[PDB]
């Protein structure tokens, strides 16, 4: 509440856009409310787009910036999850995020990079290549690194909207290991 | 390998059909391989259909049965997850599963009921009503109850195919709690 207004731009994918949530339930809205509750005179613009890849973010970063009433004081950069989820090459997410950060650096807008994590079913080579993007870029650009901020959703499954669980091949094997003894016993009796 | 052949019918949804898996990677195929490895002369027919509700299962249970070369010795019944995931009424999943089990009882085919669990984001009233279906029906029909056989997928996230995580409203709040201190600190410096 006290002081001049601080403009924060939340630039991201569904985790900022608020997929199947009301606008005032989305991360940018709730973050703003918590900042102001702590006494900061902060306005957070929601520029999340569900489905955005790093490539889609790069295609629109300049237009989003030039559309605001003034240059934002701070950008929250949160992209890459959709790259990883669609199996796009980790090096291409790195390339696009690097260039997004270049355009922000060229305008002297400071950035907080929201780190993302590869889904653990994917290859270890992919996982290393993807996960290292965010600390690597944060160092190169002297951005703050916000770590894996959907970590509480991994701890607490009741915080995530319901969806289908589809096992991998190895997940089916664990399902069999879990049930084969009981099925074997039933078959033994008839 | 030794003895006369035992015919098991796997009647279910994507968790039996093997969504985005090869047929020989699906639960019915791998269960068969593990049973035979333990010395049982068992053939498991995959009658999983991805997307099947309890209602869809009921509409096709008689045709699946009458299509086999003889009457199956054992049915694995695994439905309800899609009901719960689509927000269909728990009482309607109970009604359809009851009737499926009636048709099997009327043919004297013994059944193992695969219990399902409501996603923890859903209401506690829904969760109670849905989760109680499977032990309740198993008692009424003297079916074996296989408990929550995708339990290992909840333990080990690397066993499940990757997909989007969409927070609830309360999940967004946990995300804010996770990040507000660091964002507050960054804003305090500029
Ligand atoms: Ca509402
Ligand atoms: Ca300003
Ligand atoms: Ca500038
Ligand atoms: Ca293959
Ligand atoms: Ca037989
Ligand atoms: Ca019969």
Numbering used by the authors:
A (entry chain A), B (entry chain A): 16 to 205
Task: Quote the study on this structure.
Here, we reported the enzymatic characterizations and crystal structures of marine bacterial esterases CrmE10 and AlinE4. The results showed that both CrmE10 and AlinE4 belong to the SGNH-hydrolase superfamily and the bacterial lipolytic enzyme GDSL family. Among these four residues, Ser and His serve as catalytic residues, and Ser, Gly, and Asn serve as oxyanion hole residues.
According to sequence alignment, the catalytic triad of CrmE10 consisted of Ser29, Asp178, and His181, and it was composed of Ser13, Asp162, and His165 in AlnE4. Mutants CrmE10-S29A, CrmE10-D178A, and CrmE10-H181A had no enzymatic activities, which confirmed that these residues were crucial for the activity. Hence, this Asp might participate in destabilizing the conformation of the loop in the resting state and in changing it to a more stable conformation when the substrate bound the enzyme. In addition, one key residue (Asp162 in AlinE4/Asp178 in CrmE10) was found to be able to stabilize the conformation of both esterases and the metal ion Cd2+ reduced enzymatic activity by blocking proton transfer and substrate binding.
